[PDB]
Amino acid sequence: CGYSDRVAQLTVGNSTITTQEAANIVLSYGEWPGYCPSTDATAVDKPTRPDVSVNRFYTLSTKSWKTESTGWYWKFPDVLNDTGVFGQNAQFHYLYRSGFCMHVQCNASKFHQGALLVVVIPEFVVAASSPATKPNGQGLYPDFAHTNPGKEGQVFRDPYVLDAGIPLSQALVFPHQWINLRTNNCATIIMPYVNALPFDSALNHSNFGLAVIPISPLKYCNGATTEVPITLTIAPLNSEFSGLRQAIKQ
Amino acid sequence: CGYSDRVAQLTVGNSTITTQEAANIVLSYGEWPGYCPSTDATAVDKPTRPDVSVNRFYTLSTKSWKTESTGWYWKFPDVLNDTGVFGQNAQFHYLYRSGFCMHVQCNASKFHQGALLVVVIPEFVVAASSPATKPNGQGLYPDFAHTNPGKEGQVFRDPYVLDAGIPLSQALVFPHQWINLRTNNCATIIMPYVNALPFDSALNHSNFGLAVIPISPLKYCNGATTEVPITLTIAPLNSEFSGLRQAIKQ
Amino acid sequence: NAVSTLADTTISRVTAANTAASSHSLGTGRVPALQAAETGASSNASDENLIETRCVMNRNGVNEASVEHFYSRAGLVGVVEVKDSGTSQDGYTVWPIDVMGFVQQRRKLELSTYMRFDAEFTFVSNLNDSTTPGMLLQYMYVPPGAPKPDGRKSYQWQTATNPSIFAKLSDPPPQVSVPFMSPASAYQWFYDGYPTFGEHKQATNLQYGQCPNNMMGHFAIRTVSESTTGKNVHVRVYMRIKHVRAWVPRPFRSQAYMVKNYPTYSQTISNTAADRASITTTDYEGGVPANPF
Amino acid sequence: NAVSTLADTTISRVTAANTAASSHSLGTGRVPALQAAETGASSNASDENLIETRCVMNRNGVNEASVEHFYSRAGLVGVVEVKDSGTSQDGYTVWPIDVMGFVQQRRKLELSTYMRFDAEFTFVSNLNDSTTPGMLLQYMYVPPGAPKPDGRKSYQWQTATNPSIFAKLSDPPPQVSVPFMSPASAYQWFYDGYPTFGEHKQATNLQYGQCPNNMMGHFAIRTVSESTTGKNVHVRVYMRIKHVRAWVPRPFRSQAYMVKNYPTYSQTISNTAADRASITTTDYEGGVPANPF
Amino acid sequence: GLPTELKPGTNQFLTTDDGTSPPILPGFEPTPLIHIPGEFTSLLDLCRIETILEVNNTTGTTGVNRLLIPVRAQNNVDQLCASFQVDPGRNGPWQSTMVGQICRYYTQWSGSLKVTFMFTGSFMATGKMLIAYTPPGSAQPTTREAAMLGTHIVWDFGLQSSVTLVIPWISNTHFRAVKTGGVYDYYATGIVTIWYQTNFVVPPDTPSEANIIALGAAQENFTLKLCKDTDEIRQTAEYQN
Amino acid sequence: GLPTELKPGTNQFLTTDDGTSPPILPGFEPTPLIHIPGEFTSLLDLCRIETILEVNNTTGTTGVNRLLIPVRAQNNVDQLCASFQVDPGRNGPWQSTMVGQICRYYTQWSGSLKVTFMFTGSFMATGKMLIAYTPPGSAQPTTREAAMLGTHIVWDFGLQSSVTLVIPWISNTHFRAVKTGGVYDYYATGIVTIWYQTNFVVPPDTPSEANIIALGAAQENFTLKLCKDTDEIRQTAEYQN
Amino acid sequence: GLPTELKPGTNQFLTTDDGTSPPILPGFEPTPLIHIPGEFTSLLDLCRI
Amino acid sequence: AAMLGTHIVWDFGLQSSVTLVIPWISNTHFRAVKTGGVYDYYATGIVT
Amino acid sequence: TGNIATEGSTINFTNINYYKDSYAASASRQDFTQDPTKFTSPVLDAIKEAAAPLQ
Amino acid sequence: TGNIATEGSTINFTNINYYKDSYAASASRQDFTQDPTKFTSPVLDAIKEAAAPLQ
Ligand SMILES: CCCCCCCCCCCCCCCCCC(=O)O
Ligand SMILES: CCCCCCCCCCCCCCCCCC(=O)O
Ligand SMILES: CCCCCCCCCCCCCC(=O)O
Ligand SMILES: CCCCCCCCCCCCCC(=O)O
C-alpha cells in the first residue's frame, strides 16, 4: 500500500478494540513480543503460558482531560498486577515476562483541539523534587504511591522533566505516539519484553512506565462537551509465569 | 542389574565375611588396590608379596555402642602393625604399601535405631585441644596414645570437629558409608594405597584413619538388649614389604 | 595468514550518505513534505525531494559517533582519600565502587538504560602538594561479601583470593582490565522497582531504585605501613569502559543531580533551553541588506 | 604452524550442564527421588525427574572453579622483619620458608592433602613509614643444609651456588619462579606420623605430624651494608602457586588455628553454623500474603 | 628484543589511549548475553529521531508551554509568527532536542537538519504558513518578501497535520563548529522564520488560537567529529555527588 | 623492537596476574610424578558431594546434636517439623556443607541445589513428610496448605531410608550473589520447610522420637563465578600464626 | 620479548626523532582533502623560481 | 467487572455500525429456549 | 583508507592481546553499524516517502 | 568463544616462556577437567537413577 489505513481492528483473546482514526501502530524497537527462547532462559521450572486467559485487552483507567491537566503515568505490569487472571498468575508466581499492546482512547469533536504525547518509558524511575530551602528534604525519595500508582495511575507534578529530571522534549526517543484531536483519537504501542533479565518479579519490578502528557492544552468554545475522557487499555502478549508458590499481593 | 544387592560375601585369603544387609561396597576414589608398578617404584630391593598370609580379614576390635558414646578411630596400618604375619612382615621390613578392605559390623533389632558414619580419612592428623585459659597448654600436642591407638582404637573427645579442627559434617568428602540400623548392618570401604611416596614405613607413618562416629544416637525401649557391639574387620590387599632387617616394634 | 589479519586492523573510513542530483517536480499525488508525526515515526523526507540538490559524493567519516568511541575514554569515577593524619589516622579507606558519583561520566552512561562493558581502571595517586614520593600503597578489590578490612594491618590484606595491586606513588599509575561483573545479562543505570518484597511504607523510601545487579563491591586502599604516616593520599580512580554494547536510549539529563544513586532534582526547574526576549528574536547581526526589497 | 598455536591460547568457555524438557510421570516402578545415602554415594537424581522442567541451553561458564584458577592467586605467606635498630641491630634475618603461617592461604591449601605445584614468590619490601628509598637488599634462598648466615657480613653471602636476588627497595618488587622442590612426589600438608623411629614418650610430642618432605630451607635477607643502618625493613613474601595438581579433598577448617605446623583448636568449639532462635525460625520477611488460604 | 630504548610518552597516562591492561580475574566467564530489544551502536541513529524544539524559550513562558509556537487569526497579513536559528550548538531552541544534546558532545557537525511542524488546532481550522530558511549571510528577514528568497516551504493545514522543512547543508566548510558566537559566527547556519502565507481561518464556535509543535532532527548525511565534554551539566567541584 | 614506550600498569604487582618470572634453579628436574588416587581438578566436583546440613543450629543444641532434625509422634496434624533457607552463602545450616564453604570463596552461583533427607528411626517406624521449597517471593509458610503450593516432595519412609528434594534454579538473574541480607535479599533463594504429611507412627516398645539427617549438595548445572576471599576464618592481625 | 635491557638514549627527547606517539582521539576521520592548485612537495622546486 | 468478559470497544466514525458476536459458551450442546426457575441452567448471559 | 590525512598505509602491528583473558584486549572498534529504523520508523505499515501517510 | 563479553577475537600473543626452564612458564590453565564420579559415586554396583537402590 505505502500508507497506514485510518480504520483498524485489534483482537487479542476474547476482546476486540475497533478504532476508525488509528494513526498506525508503533512496534517498539521493531521487535514483536515472543516467549523466552531456550537459549535466553535461565530458570529450569516449566513456565505456565495461560494464553487467552491473561492475553487480552483490559480497560483499567479513564481520566478526565482538563485545560490545566498536567498528565498521568502508570507502571506495567504494576497497573494490571491485581486485575483479572493475569493479576492472580502474577501474585501466585515469582518470575514474570510479557510484552504488551497499549491503546489510549481519546475522542473529541472536530471543534476541540489539543495534543497528548503517549510514550512508553522503559525503567521509568520516578524522581522526587526536593525544595531548594533544605538540601535533604523528606521528599527526596518518592513514596510507594508515586513509584507504584496501580490501576488508578498518578498525576505528573512536573511533566516538563517527566518527574525524572529528563526533558519531555527528548522523551520522543522512547516508543511514543501523539493523539492530535485534529487527526486521530487513539495511540497503540506494541512493546516487547525489555529487561536485562529474561524473567522478573511482576510485583517488585516495573518493566515500563506508560505516560500520557498533554503538550498542547485542550481548548474548546463555550457550548462543546467539557468532559473529554482519556482511557488506557492494555493487553499483555506472550505472558509466561514461573516459580509457583503462595499468592503474594505486592 | 542397576541396583545393589542386599546380600553380599567378601572372601580374601582364608577368611570370608558374609553380610545379608550390605548397603553396597565403597571403592575409594574409584580405584582398586594394586601392586606398585615399575614406573612408580623407586626402591631397587625386590619386594616380598606374602599374599594369603598377610592379605586376609583380621577382626581386631569390638566396641560397645551406648546412648552417649561419642565415637572411635583407628590408624591403618598402625591397628594391624602387631597382629598376625602382616605384623611380623611390617616389623621386619622398612618400606610398606597396601590398600585395605574395611568392614564395620553392627547389628541391632528392628526396634533399635541410630546411625553410625564410618569414614576413612587419609592422613588423619589428630589435633590436641588447648584449654582457653593458657595459650600453650601442655595438651597442645597429642601424646603417642592418641596419635597411634593400636588395636584397641581411641574414643573421640570432640567428634564434631573429628578431633582435627575440621567439621564432621564435611567428613562425607572422604570415602564414607553409613550404618543405619533401619536399613543396613555393615559398612565396607575398599581403599587403595594413597600416599605421596610409593612405599612408606608401616610403623612411623599411618596412611589412613578409620573413624566410626554415632551421628544419630542409639535409642531403644526398655526390654531390648542394651549391649550393641561395633566390630572392625580389616583385610590388607596387595601388600608389598621391602628393606628386610632386624624386627623393630614401633 | 595472521599477517593479512594485522594489515586490516587500522580503523577504515565509513563515509556518510551521498546526495543525488534532483530537478523540479510539478505534479499532484506525490507529496514527500507532508508527514504524520502522530504515527510516532520520524519524517522520511530527503533533501533531494524538498529542494533541487546537486550530486554530492559525501566523504565525511561517521566512525566516531559509535557507542565504542563515545564511551572508550577514561573519566573520573571516584576520589578515595586515604586519611592518615589529625583526627583520621586510619591509614586505610574502603570506597564503594559506583560510577554515578561525577556528572561528566554519569550523564554519558545514563544515555543508555542497559549497558554491558569491560572497564579499564587507572589509579592516579599523589599527596596534598601533588608530590609522588616512594610510598607503597595496596589497592585491593573486595567483591560483594568478601570481608572488608577494619584496620591498617588486618588479616583481610593477605589477599589469598581478593585481587590486589601494590604500587608506589612514585610509579606510573596502576591500570587493570575488569570484566563484565553482574548477575544480570547487562548493567542497568535505571531500575524501576525494589530489590526486596515488602510493602515499602517507610517515611524514607531509600530502597526504591536500588538493584544490587550493579553494586560491584568495594576497593580497599591502604599505605602498607606499621603506624600513622601523618600524610593523606588522594586516589583519583579513572574508568574507561570498553567492549561496549548499549540498549534503549534515554533523554540526556537536563536538571542538576543532587544525590548519587537516585534521580532527584531541585523544585527550581532549570529550563532545557536558555530563554531569550521574544519568540521572534534571534542573536545574529548578519550583513547590511542591499535593498532595505 | 606455531602461529595457529598462538590463535588457540585464549581461555575457551566450557558451559555448564543443560536442562532437558520433562513432563509428568504417573507410573509405579520408576522412583528417581528415592536414594540410599547409606551406600556412601551422593544422590543421582536430576531436576528433570523430580519436577517438570523446560529445555534450558545453559551458557554459564565453569572455567573458574578449577584448582588452577582457585590457587593461581598470590597470597601473603610470610612477613620477614630485617631489624637493624635499637636492641636488634643484626641487619639480617633468616626466615624459615613455610606457607602455613597466614590463615587465608593456609586454609585454601589445606583443602587438599597432597599438592604438586611450581610457585612464583614476590618480595614487597618497604620501611615503617611505607617509604621505599634507594636501599639495596639481598634475598638469598638457603636450601636445607646450606649454611645459614650468622652475621651481616659473613662468607655465606658470597652465593657461589645459593640463588640470591639483589634489589633496591626503590625498584618494583622482585619476583622469581620456584620449581616443585620435594623428595616426595607431591607436597603433603597433613602427615599422620613421625619423621624418626623411636617410642615418642616426651611430655611434649613436637615431632608428631612434621614431615621434612615439606620443609624447603630458609630465605636469608640482609641490607647490603657495612654497619647498622638504624632502619628496620619489612619484607612481605607473596606466593602464587601454579602448574597445580591436587589430590584427596578434605573438609575446609572450621576452628581458628593456634600454632603454625600443628592442627590444634581451643577447647571452646565454635559451631560451623551461626545459631538461630529455633529450628523453625528463618530470617526473611517476604511479601504480604494475598489470602491470610 | 632485549636491546630497547624508551621514547617520549613513557610512564604517561593518556585517558583516550586504547590499550591492554592486565586482567584482575583469571578464567572469569561473564554472564551469558541474552537478546534485549532496542540495541543502538551509533549516536547518528539517535540524531535521526524527531524530538521537540523549545521555540517558545521566552522570559515569561514556563514548563510545557515553552514547547508550543502560538498561532491565531490575524487582523494584519504577513506578521512574523516565530523565528529560531538552526545551529544545534547554540544556546536556544535546539538545546531541547536529542540532536542538539549529542552535538554538544562533539566539536564539528555536517549534513542536512530536519524540522517537522505538527499543527494542533481543531479539524475545522485551516491556514497556510511560509516556513523559510535563510542561509548564513543575512539577518532575520523583517518582511515575508525578504524571507521568500531563501529555501522555503508553503505548508497547507489539512488531514496530514505535519510538514518537513529539510534545512539543506549550505556551508563554505565541510564541517561547522558546534561552538558559535564571536569569531565562531563564521559557522552560523542561518535563521528559520515562520510567516502567515494566508490567515488562520476558523468557523464560529471554534478556538481562534492554536499551537504548532516543531520537531528537530538530522538527515541521513548528518555527521559529527572530535568528541569533547559537554557544557550542558555542572556539579560544584571535583569532590561532589 | 628497540623503540618502546611504557604504558600505565608498569612497575605494579597485581597478585592475580598470570605471568612468567625468571627461574631460580637452572636445569632442575622435579621428582617424578607417581600415580596418587583421588586427584581432583575442579571445585564443582567437590560441590556435588552430599555433606550434612546443620539444620538444628539452635541456641541450646551442641556438637553432633546440631546435625539432627528431631521427629516424633504428634498429637496434632500439620505442625512444622523444621525450616531452613536454601542460599548457600547465608550464615545458617548451609555453612556446614562443602558446597556452602566453596560458595563463600566465590561471589555469584547458579544452578539447582540438592537436599537428601535420611531417616534414622527404627525399622518399625513409618511416616510421610511433605518437604516443600518456596521460591523467593513469600515468607516461611505458616500452614502446610500454604507450603504445598510450592515445589514439594511427599516422602514415604520404607526400606529406602533417603529421598532427594532437588531445589530447582528459579531465579530472575542467571547468577545469584552469595552475599545476602539488606538489598542483597534480592538474591534470596527461598525457604525449605518439612511438614508431617501423616503422623510418625510406631508400634509398642519402639522409640517414638527419631532423627532426620539432611545432606546438602549441588546438581550438575551448578556453577560459581568471581573468586574472592572467604569470611569464614579470621586471625587477629597481619602478623600472627 | 619479556627480557629487555634499556640502552643509552632512553627517556631522551630528540626533536628530529621520527617516531610514533599515542593518538589523543580514537576513530577521528579528518575532513576530506579537496583538490587545491599549487601543491609543492620539494623546496628545490621553490629554488628554481 | 464487565471488561473481563467477551467485549468489543466500538469507535463512532464513518462506519456507523459494529457487531458483537456473542460466542456459544455453553456446557450443553443445546440450550432450552424456556428459561427461569431450574431452566436458568441454560441462561446465556448479559450484554451491557 | 585511514585517518592519516595523506597517501600512506605503513605496517599495522596493533590490536594484540598479551593475556589469556580476552576481556584484557583493546577496545573492539573495528566494526561500525548504523541501523536507525528501530527508532526512526518503528510503525507496522511502512510509509513510502511520496504517499500522504494517513488515508 | 572467550570472556570478552562481545563479538571479537583479535590476535593472541600470550602463554610465551622466555626461559630454558619450563617451570618458569605462566599458569597452565588451557585445560578444564570435570570428573566428579570418583567422589560422588564410588560404589561397585553402579545404581541407575530410576531403580530403588537396595533390593
Ligand atoms: C584493585 C582494583 C581492581 C579493579 C576492580 C574494579 C571492579 C569494578 C566493577 C565494575 C564497574 C562497573 C559497575 C558500576 C555500577 C555502579 C553504579 C551504581 O549502581 O551506583
Ligand atoms: C631468593 C628467593 C627465592 C625463592 C625460593 C623459594 C623456595 C620455596 C620452597 C617451595 C615452597 C612450597 C613448600 C612449602 C611447604 C612448607 C609448609 C610446612 O611444612 O609448614
Ligand atoms: C611485524 C609484521 C607485521 C605485518 C603487518 C601487515 C603489513 C602488510 C603490508 C601492507 C600494509 C597494510 C595495509 C595494506 O594492505 O595496504
Ligand atoms: C605476532 C603474530 C601472532 C599471531 C597469532 C595468531 C592470530 C590468528 C588470527 C585469528 C585470531 C585468533 C582466533 C581465531 O582463530 O579466530
Residue numbers in the entry:
A (entry chain B), B (entry chain B): 7 to 256
C (entry chain A), D (entry chain A): 9 to 300, 304
E (entry chain C), F (entry chain C): 1 to 241
G (entry chain C): 1 to 49
H (entry chain C): 146 to 193
I (entry chain D), J (entry chain D): 15 to 69
From the paper:
Coxsackievirus A6 (CV-A6) has recently overtaken enterovirus A71 and CV-A16 as the primary causative agent of hand, foot, and mouth disease worldwide. To initiate infection, enterovirus particles progress through a set of distinct functional intermediates: the infectious native virion expands into a destabilised altered or A-particle, in which the internal capsid protein VP4 has been displaced. The genome is released through a capsid opening, leaving the empty capsid as the non-infectious end product. The major capsid proteins VP1, VP2, and VP3 are arranged with pseudo-T = 3 icosahedral symmetry with VP1 subunits forming pentamers around the fivefold axes and VP2 and VP3 forming heterohexamers around the threefold symmetry axes of the capsid.
